[PDB]
Amino acid sequence: SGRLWSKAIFAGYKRGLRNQREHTALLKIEGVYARDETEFYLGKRCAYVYKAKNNTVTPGGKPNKTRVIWGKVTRAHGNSGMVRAKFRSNLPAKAIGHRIRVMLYPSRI
Amino acid sequence: KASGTLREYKVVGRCLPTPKCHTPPLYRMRIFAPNHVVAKSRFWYFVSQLKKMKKSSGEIVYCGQVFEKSPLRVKNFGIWLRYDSRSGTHNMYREYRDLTTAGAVTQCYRDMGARHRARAHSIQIMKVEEIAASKCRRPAVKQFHDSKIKFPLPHRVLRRQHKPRFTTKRPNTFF
Amino acid sequence: SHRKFSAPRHGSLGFLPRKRSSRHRGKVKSFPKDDPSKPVHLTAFLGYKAGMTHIVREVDRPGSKVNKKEVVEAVTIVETPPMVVVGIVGYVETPRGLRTFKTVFAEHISDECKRRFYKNWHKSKKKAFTKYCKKWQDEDGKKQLEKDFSSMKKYCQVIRVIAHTQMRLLPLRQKKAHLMEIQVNGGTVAEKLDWARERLEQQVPVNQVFGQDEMIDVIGVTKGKGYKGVTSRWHTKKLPRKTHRGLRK
Amino acid sequence: EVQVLVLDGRGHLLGRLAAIVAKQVLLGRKVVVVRCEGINISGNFYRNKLKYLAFLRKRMNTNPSRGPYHFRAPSRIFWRTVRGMLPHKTKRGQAALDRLKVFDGIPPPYDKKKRMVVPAALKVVRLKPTRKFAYLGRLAHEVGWKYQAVTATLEEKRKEKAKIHYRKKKQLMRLRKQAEKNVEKKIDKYTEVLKTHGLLV
Amino acid sequence: MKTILSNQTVDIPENVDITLKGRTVIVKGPRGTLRRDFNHINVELSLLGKKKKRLRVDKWWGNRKELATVRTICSHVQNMIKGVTLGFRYKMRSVYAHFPINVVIQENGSLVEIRNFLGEKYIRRVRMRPGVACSVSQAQKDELILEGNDIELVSNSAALIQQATTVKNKDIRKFLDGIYVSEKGTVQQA
Amino acid sequence: VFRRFVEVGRVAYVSFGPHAGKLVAIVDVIDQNRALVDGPCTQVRRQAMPFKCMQLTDFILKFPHSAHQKYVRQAWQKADINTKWAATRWAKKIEARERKAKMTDFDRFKVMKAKKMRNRIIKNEVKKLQKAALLKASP
RNA sequence: UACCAUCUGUGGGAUUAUGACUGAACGCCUCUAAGUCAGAAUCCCGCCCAGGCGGAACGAUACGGCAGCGCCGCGGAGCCUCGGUUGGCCUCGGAUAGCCGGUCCCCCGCCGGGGUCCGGUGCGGAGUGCCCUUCGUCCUGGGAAACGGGGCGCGGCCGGAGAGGCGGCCGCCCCCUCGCCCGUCACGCACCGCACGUUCGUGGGGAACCUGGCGCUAAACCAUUCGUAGACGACCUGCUU
RNA sequence: GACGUCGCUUUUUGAUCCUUCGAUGUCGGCUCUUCCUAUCAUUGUGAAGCAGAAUUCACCAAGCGUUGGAUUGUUCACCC
RNA sequence: UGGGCCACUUUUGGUAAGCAGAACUGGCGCUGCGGGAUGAACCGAACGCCGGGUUAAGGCGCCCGAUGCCGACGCUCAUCA
RNA sequence: GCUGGGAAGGCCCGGCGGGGAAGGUGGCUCGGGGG
Ligand SMILES: [Mg+2]
Ligand SMILES: [Mg+2]
Ligand SMILES: [Mg+2]
Ligand SMILES: [Mg+2]
Ligand SMILES: [Mg+2]
Ligand SMILES: [Mg+2]
Ligand SMILES: [Mg+2]
Ligand SMILES: [Mg+2]
Ligand SMILES: [Mg+2]
Ligand SMILES: [Mg+2]
Ligand SMILES: [Mg+2]
Ligand SMILES: [Mg+2]
Ligand SMILES: [Mg+2]
Ligand SMILES: [Mg+2]
Ligand SMILES: [Mg+2]
Ligand SMILES: [Mg+2]
Ligand SMILES: [Mg+2]
Ligand SMILES: [Mg+2]
Ligand SMILES: [Mg+2]
Ligand SMILES: [Mg+2]
Ligand SMILES: [Mg+2]
Ligand SMILES: [Mg+2]
Ligand SMILES: [Mg+2]
Ligand SMILES: [Mg+2]
Ligand SMILES: [Mg+2]
Ligand SMILES: [Mg+2]
């Protein structure tokens, strides 16, 4: 019943032109295209959810094929939406262009 | 000398009092500068070109911003300037419409950079004064000298071209 | 630097990949342009090269030196028995070109036509178009077929007739027939469609396709010579007699 | 947003539309661009034609069949501009280039959908009105595209069908207004709720 | 330098009726009707009178290059008004030294054929623009009269014919043969 | 064509800037891009303003150019604009826009229920209307 | 096999230089500024040659035996494997120095087109938009409905060809007056603060088992011949009537 | 186009010595393809001290063509 | 180690040269990194292995991080911009 | 806090007033369109 997370897109890693830093991720959240709108999402949890072959244990449920890399939004990256986030493990490069959930967790509203 | 929006300063200075003339004369300039440090630098430049006086054997007895006397009345401004191109240097007289003297001088700086590719270190402003409407020469100001002036805003180009970035309806320019 | 004496290009670059033809028949690749003011007619035919001989005729060319005198000219003889129209294909023109919309074949297609459809007629069961002529003789299949005709009439822009040669009238070893699409020109699509379905399952002679003393085009496959060198293949100049690793290079 | 984004190319400037499309298609977002024959290019027709003919001149003189392929359709010209703005020698750029699809005219999975517009690439927004421009369809047709007449007739058919559908929609809207005027006395309780919270001026 | 307003006005006679569907002028005098689309120029056009019928064109923040177009549009509309009131006629005379230029007018004044231009055997045929009628004059001997309502069509047809009869590989200071526009008048002369 | 003009006394609507969403009277014109500007009854003191930031309305006040604030203020008050505007439908369109922005969650629920029922009633009446309008049997 | 014999060798478009038309700038003039014209061994295309890790239409689709295959089932039970995704928008043409909507009088075999007239225009008949909206049941009222809802239930008809793979309407019968809004009444694992929950989805692909009804019973390659072909492959042919 | 003066080119010859001396086969011709244009001819033009014919000077233009010989190893040259 | 080479400014021969020869300082050689698309020497800055923050030079349509600012004022149309 | 102990600006029909002018208001003269 109902979505309860905002949809973002893994846009790429933090980088200059010829050096990329894979510990920080760049996220484009749908609907926000300025810094003073990115202010709401500034400490929210975020998740890269994906499927694989083997079964993993699910908290409060039965084992299935879904896996999650957890992270959180850390700050804004440049004048038009585009936050930068920090995950527990660095995100795989096959996730670029794909969906990342922003979870409305720890709440300040 | 770079820019911004300019302020007008009056800088008053003098040579240092030697035990030959115990009271050297004071000199005063109106100087359009980004800040008072640039104002004092330009003062020493101009007064060193005019009088045999340098920053070492001299002092600034006053450096203070001239506020605009009537910043709510639209005035005409005549600027007498000199500058130098890639070839030799030229005298010039420009006219502007503005609320502030420093605003008109800033307008003159951006205009000289636009039309003659002249840099601020090339420009020297030598006179700036408030012209009435019936004494102006330039048609770009005399066309605004009209009491019953009236014009539309014909072709309103959309500016928020990215909010939204994808719409379903094409914009309208007539309003 | 500067090849020092002008000579033109040996051979033509408008003719190359200079490879074996992928077909044996000879594709038209361009039919005549359609104008609906003309009557309905065919635009091509399929013959067989018999041989050559020569003729004697009297020329009527005013101002020419051979005016009202007799000349001898070589001729080529092409045997053209009448072609059997057995099918009809329609084409619609799209922004990607011109695609085939719908083909309709006829009942009772001949064995040389089915021979064209098979690669080994000896070991086959000869089952081609049997379920199709079933739907021709049926009545539920019959209303389906006229629905296809009506849809072709209301949508297609180019119709062509599938006709085969009848090889039993030829002195050749080949019993397998040659099929061909021949564009139908000169009318509305409805007019040429009823005309072609009138001519369906039927013989068309070269007397009806072509006429006396008109100028036509011949499309075919050039006589085969095999792997040749540059002197035969491009007619380059032979190198002098004292050339170490070969002259014909 | 997990649906396809369908843009109408008519009235848009080539490189600006290509840049917008390229960033979208790298970020995800399957994009269809229809009516690529209506795309405009700034600068006059002759100098745009000369730019294309210089491109046609660029040819691998040892093997032109191996050389650069000069596509002629306006859809493929737009596609090659987006290809030039993409990182197409990588798997990511190739996946984005596959995520993009372009068409001449409007083919019929998309003729019965709503087409969007990118105002940052529109000619009326990005060019002064006293400036020359060219048409991608005319440019393509004069550099060797074969299919501008068939596309024009199919577009005329599509416009007739769209006029019929639009007249149906207008009759439905008139009926809905009539129905509001009929039963306003039983929706007056609900109408004032919507007016209170900013819907229904 | 952008002038705030540049404008000027065309008077309209009583027997003409003009309509403005935007930047599209339809002129409706007695000799027919004309229509011209000016949607390549950013001006505004307005009808003023109810019994005097002035037409203003306005430019509103243009520079020099687009302030020219004001007077150009007004002159085009005045040529339309003249074309529907009086109609344009171009009288062009045939000029030859030795070989007489034989002009024959095929169907209903819409085709002209010049036969013996400079003694050549090639027959040149010029198609008139639609709405322009050519004829041989009766008052003077070797003279074409080509008439119409559109000045652009009539003058382009005259220039077509004139550049058709042209001399090649010879001295065009001698060899002065051709057909040249002698005068650009009207019909009904009032 | 061109029903609205930049002139002295023309009332414009400031749409963005520090004075966004405001009403403004044009006092004078400063050189093709700015206007001397004063809203004394809408709490905007006199300054220069870009034509890119202002949008022209249909109200024109009556005072000579470069007049003082008391003159523009009493010209605003005699035939006050704060009642002509706001009961113009541009202004209540803005007002509806901002209350729709301020609409809360429980309000959103009530709007959903009301709009759902209203659409049900309108849709049923539309169905009845077209099924009655199909009663056509004339030669 | 030879200019050492014989045959065949082609059409348009935009335009370049140039020559002009109307016509300002500059109350005159001016091929030029806006707008038009003619224009070539050039250029592009046709014609002709090849035919894409590019498509299309159509044919035939495996036993005399246990022997396969296809279709109609949600018809069932399961296995592996690839994972994305987490409501929909079912559509005028367009203009931008202008648009959009609705009506009274003319015309088109009683709908569409004009001319009035009336609205709106920082687009509210609004993509900053619109439509759907999900905790579920039980007693009990009120209006909304009553000309209804739901049958992967039957049959028929019409429209869609550019890539139609779709959409719409009638007749037969079978269940409910429930579902939409405001209320009354209580109950459900209320799993004791905690993550991958929530859809698309009966997803896609691949083997295998059971279960019925309707059907179908082929080709290709080799070998062999041919010589219109050919280095070899390839290619063109024939083989109980 | 004198006296002067501004350039371009790398089809001349110099100047230089950066690459190559555990090796880049060193003149010319023959053969064959492609490119350039600073156009000799041909297409379309403008100018002339362009009457015609012939010629000269320019422009768009490199699509197409630019030969057979005597002498010389010759590139160049010169003649038929 | 006693083959040096390059750059601002000064400077000799030479028409000049990515030529030859000096002075002064810095570099490269012996040196990676950010920028100059690419590059011994330019511009920034010199380096143990990492996290956070911020910068230089340089940028911010898309490739490609960053203007998706309702940025400011002008100039400019190029049939080799 | 400082500044020209900020400059401008608001209100007090600022009041006795004194002048001055045009990007010239009213009133007048002339020219055009609506009873
Ligand atoms: Mg040569
Ligand atoms: Mg030997
Ligand atoms: Mg004139
Ligand atoms: Mg001559
Ligand atoms: Mg021969
Ligand atoms: Mg020209
Ligand atoms: Mg032309
Ligand atoms: Mg032509
Ligand atoms: Mg050397
Ligand atoms: Mg050296
Ligand atoms: Mg060596
Ligand atoms: Mg070696
Ligand atoms: Mg070797
Ligand atoms: Mg070698
Ligand atoms: Mg040239
Ligand atoms: Mg060629
Ligand atoms: Mg040594
Ligand atoms: Mg040195
Ligand atoms: Mg060393
Ligand atoms: Mg060191
Ligand atoms: Mg270093
Ligand atoms: Mg670097
Ligand atoms: Mg560089
Ligand atoms: Mg760091
Ligand atoms: Mg960059
Ligand atoms: Mg970026």
Alpha-carbon torsion (D134, D137, D140, D142), positive or negative: negative
Pairing of the two strands D5-8 and D31-34: parallel
Residue E27 vs residues D53, E12, E17, E41, E155: alpha-carbon distances, Å: 44, 10, 6, 19, 20
Interchain proximity D187–F122, CB inside 8 Å: yes
What CA–CA distance (Å, rounded) separates D22 from D79?
A: 10
**N-terminal to C-terminal alpha carbon distance within chain A:** 22
Residue C190: CB atoms within 10 A of its CB come to: 13
C67 φ, ψ (degrees, to nearest 5): -65, 130
Residue E183 vs residues A34, E82, E93, E177: alpha-carbon distances, Å: 70, 16, 9, 18
Question: Where do we find the tokens 């922004």?
Answer: C95
What CA–CA distance (Å, rounded) separates B156 from D13?
A: 19
Residue among C146, C96, C204, F65 at smallest CA distance from B148: F65
Residue of D6, D8, D16, D116 for testing the chain B interface, max B β-carbons within 10 Å: D116
What CA–CA distance (Å, rounded) separates D161 from B153?
A: 39
What CA–CA distance (Å, rounded) separates B1 from B128?
A: 19
Chains D and F touch (3+ CB pairs under 8 A): yes
Alpha-carbon torsion (D83, D86, D92, D98), positive or negative: negative
Interface of D with A in 22-51 (CB under 8 A): 26-28
Experimental method: cryo-EM
Closest protein CA to C1' of nucleotide I51, residue: A23
Instruction: Quote the minimal CA–CA distance from E64 to chain D in Å.
Output: 13
Beta-carbon pairs below 8 A across chains C and D: 10
Q: CA of F64 and C1' of J25: distance in angstroms?
A: 9
Instruction: Indicate the burial class of B77 (C-beta count within 10 angstroms; 0-12, 13-18, 19 or more).
Output: buried
Q: HSE on the CB side for C69, CA within 13 Å?
A: 8
C237 touches strand H (CB under 7 A): yes
DSSP C12: -
Q: Token pair of D3, please?
A: 């649906």
What is the maximum span of chain B, computed from C-alpha positions, in angstroms?
A: 84
CA of D89 to the centre of ligand 23 (A): 24
Contact predicate A72/A82, CB 8 Å: no
Q: CA of F108 and C1' of G137: distance in angstroms?
A: 27
Residue among F48, B93, F51 at smallest CA distance from E61: F51
C-alpha angle B52-B54-B60 in degrees, rounded to nearest 5: 115
What CA–CA distance (Å, rounded) separates E83 from E27?
A: 9
Contact predicate E30/E85, CB 8 Å: yes
DSSP β-bridge partners for residue A7: A101
What CA–CA distance (Å, rounded) separates A25 from D38?
A: 39
Contact predicate E38/E70, CB 8 Å: no
Nearest residue in E to B150, CA atom: E4
CA of C68 to the centre of ligand 9 (A): 79
Q: Which residues contact B84 (CB under 8 A, 6 or more apart)?
A: B90, B118, B122
Q: Which residues contact B60 (CB under 8 A, 6 or more apart)?
A: B11, B12, B13, B40, B43
What CA–CA distance (Å, rounded) separates B135 from E81?
A: 45
What CA–CA distance (Å, rounded) separates C209 from C45?
A: 7
What CA–CA distance (Å, rounded) separates E156 from E132?
A: 10
DSSP C226: -
Residue among B131, B89, B130, B135 at smallest CA distance from B112: B89
Interface of C with D in 83-102 (CB under 8 A): 93-97
Residue A109 vs residues A6, A40, A105, E2: alpha-carbon distances, Å: 15, 9, 11, 54
Residue among E162, E164, E166, E160 at smallest CA distance from E181: E162
F45 at B interface, C-beta within 8 A: no
DSSP β-bridge partners for residue E28: E17
Within its chain, how far is the Cα of C136 from the centroid?
Answer: 28
Residue among B96, B84, B124, B107 at smallest CA distance from B1: B124
Contacts of D97 in chain A (CB under 8 A): none
Contacts of D196 in chain F (CB under 8 A): 99
Contact predicate C193/C159, CB 8 Å: yes
Q: Which residues contact F72 (CB under 8 A, 6 or more apart)?
A: F25, F27, F38, F40, F61, F63
What CA–CA distance (Å, rounded) separates D87 from C65?
A: 71
Q: CA of E157 and C1' of G112: distance in angstroms?
A: 41
**Chains linked to C by 3 or more Cβ pairs within 8 Å:** D
What CA–CA distance (Å, rounded) separates B141 from B76?
A: 8
What CA–CA distance (Å, rounded) separates E24 from E15?
A: 20
Kindly give the interhelix angle for D136-143 and D74-85, rounded to the nearest 10 degrees: 110
Q: Please enumerate, as own/partner, the contacts of A6-9 that have beta carbons within 8 Å and a separation of 24 or more.
A: A6/A30, A6/A31, A6/A41, A6/A101, A6/A102, A6/A104, A7/A99, A7/A100, A7/A101, A7/A102, A7/D1, A8/A46, A8/A83, A8/A99, A8/A100, A8/A101, A8/A102, A9/A97, A9/A98, A9/A99, A9/A100, A9/D27, A9/D28
B132 at F interface, C-beta within 8 A: no
DSSP β-bridge partners for residue B65: B9
What CA–CA distance (Å, rounded) separates B93 from B106?
A: 15
Residue D135 vs residues B120, C139, C191, C203, F44: alpha-carbon distances, Å: 44, 54, 39, 51, 48
CA of E167 to the centre of ligand 8 (A): 21
Nucleotides of J under 7 A from a protein CB: 3-4, 6-12, 14, 22-25, 32-34
What CA–CA distance (Å, rounded) separates D104 from D101?
A: 11
Residue among F26, F84, F92 at smallest CA distance from F55: F26
What CA–CA distance (Å, rounded) separates B95 from B104?
A: 9
Residue among E24, B160, B175, B170 at smallest CA distance from D124: B170
What CA–CA distance (Å, rounded) separates E163 from E114?
A: 12
Q: Which residues contact D138 (CB under 8 A, 6 or more apart)?
A: D45, D148
DSSP D117: B
Residue C95 vs residues A51, D39, F44: alpha-carbon distances, Å: 42, 17, 60
What CA–CA distance (Å, rounded) separates F135 from D44?
A: 59
Interface of B with D in 29-88 (CB under 8 A): none
Contact predicate E92/E103, CB 8 Å: no
Q: CA of E84 and C1' of I14: distance in angstroms?
A: 82
Instruction: Quote the minimal CA–CA distance from B166 to chain D in Å.
Output: 5
Q: CA of D146 and C1' of G15: distance in angstroms?
A: 19
Contacts of D180 in chain F (CB under 8 A): 122
DSSP β-bridge partners for residue A67: A50
DSSP codes joined into one string, A43-104 = T-EEEEEEEEEEEE--TTS--EEEEEEEEEEEEE-SSSS-EEEEESSPPPGGGTTSEEEE--
Residue among E112, E155, E147 at smallest CA distance from E32: E147
Interchain proximity E61–B139, CB inside 8 Å: no
Contacts of E42 in chain D (CB under 8 A): 129-130
Instruction: Quote the minimal CA–CA distance from D113 to chain A in Å.
Output: 23
Within its chain, how far is the Cα of E94 from the centroid?
Answer: 20
C32 φ, ψ (degrees, to nearest 5): -65, 150
F105 at B interface, C-beta within 8 A: no
Helix (H) or strand (E) holding F84: helix F81-84
What CA–CA distance (Å, rounded) separates F105 from F108?
A: 5
Contact predicate A28/A97, CB 8 Å: no
Torsion of CA F67, F68, F70, F76, to 10 degrees: 40
What CA–CA distance (Å, rounded) separates D70 from F26?
A: 57
CA of C13 to the centre of ligand 1 (A): 21
Pairing of the two strands F22-30 and F10-14: antiparallel
Cis omega (within 30 of 0) for bond into B164: yes
Residue E83 vs residues E12, E32, E35, E74: alpha-carbon distances, Å: 13, 9, 11, 14
Q: Token pair of C201, please?
A: 């399952």
DSSP codes joined into one string, chain E = --BS--EEEEE--SS-EEEESSSEEEEE-TT--EEEE-TTS--EEEE--SSS-EEEEE-SSB-HHHHHHHHHHHHHHHHHHHHHHT-EEEEEEEE-SSSPP-EEEETTTTEEEE--GGG-SPPEEEEPPTTEEEEE-SSSSSEEEEEES-HHHHHHHHHHHHHHS---SS-SSS---EEEEEEEEESS--
E-assigned strands of D54-188?
A: 100-102, 133-135
Contacts of B96 in chain F (CB under 8 A): 31
Question: Where do we find the tokens 């024009």?
Answer: D152
Contact predicate C157/C93, CB 8 Å: yes
Kindly give the interhelix angle for D136-143 and D45-57, rounded to the nearest 10 degrees: 40
Q: Token pair of A102, please?
A: 């922003």
Nucleic strand G contact set for F 54-93 (CB, < 7 Å):
55-56, 88-90, 93
Q: Token pair of C139, please?
A: 């009545």
Interchain proximity F2–E44, CB inside 8 Å: yes
What CA–CA distance (Å, rounded) separates E45 from E23?
A: 7
What CA–CA distance (Å, rounded) separates D98 from D86?
A: 11
B146 at F interface, C-beta within 8 A: no
Question: Where do we find the tokens 């050096």?
Answer: A19
C3 touches strand H (CB under 7 A): yes
DSSP β-bridge partners for residue F37: F26, F47
What CA–CA distance (Å, rounded) separates B101 from B99?
A: 7
Residue among E132, E137, E141, E83 at smallest CA distance from E108: E132
Instruction: Indicate the burial class of A51 (C-beta count within 10 angstroms; 0-12, 13-18, 19 or more).
Output: exposed
Nucleic strand G contact set for D 131-190 (CB, < 7 Å):
132, 142-144, 146, 151, 154-155, 157-159, 161-163, 165-167, 169-171, 173-174, 177, 183, 186
Helix (H) or strand (E) holding B92: strand B89-98
Task: Tell me if residue D76 falls in helix, strand or coil.
Answer: helix
**Nucleotide nearest to B148 in CA–C1' terms:** J23
What CA–CA distance (Å, rounded) separates F5 from F2?
A: 7
Residue among E110, B90, E45 at smallest CA distance from F2: E45
DSSP codes joined into one string, D17-66 = HHHHHHHHHHHS--EEEE-GGG-EEES-HHHHHHHHHHHHH---SS-TTT
Nearest to E2 among F1, F2, F32 (CB): F32
Alpha-carbon torsion (E52, E58, E64, E65), positive or negative: negative
A31 touches strand G (CB under 7 A): no
What CA–CA distance (Å, rounded) separates D116 from D119?
A: 10
Contact predicate F21/F61, CB 8 Å: no
What CA–CA distance (Å, rounded) separates B167 from C116?
A: 58
Question: Where do we find the tokens 């047709």?
Answer: D141
D61 touches strand H (CB under 7 A): yes
**Chains linked to B by 3 or more Cβ pairs within 8 Å:** D, E, F
CA of E46 to the centre of ligand 13 (A): 87
What CA–CA distance (Å, rounded) separates A69 from F111?
A: 38
Residue among D20, B114, D178 at smallest CA distance from F133: D178
DSSP codes joined into one string, E85-119 = HT-EEEEEEEE-SSSPP-EEEETTTTEEEE--GGG
Residue among E151, E110, E153 at smallest CA distance from E133: E110
Number of helices and strands in chain B (H, E)? 3, 7
CA of E97 to the centre of ligand 4 (A): 18
AA letter at E128: M
D145 φ, ψ (degrees, to nearest 5): -75, 135
Residue C75 vs residues C50, C55, C78, C213, C221: alpha-carbon distances, Å: 11, 7, 10, 13, 19
Q: HSE on the CB side for C55, CA within 13 Å?
A: 9
DSSP B135: G
Resolution in A: 2.8
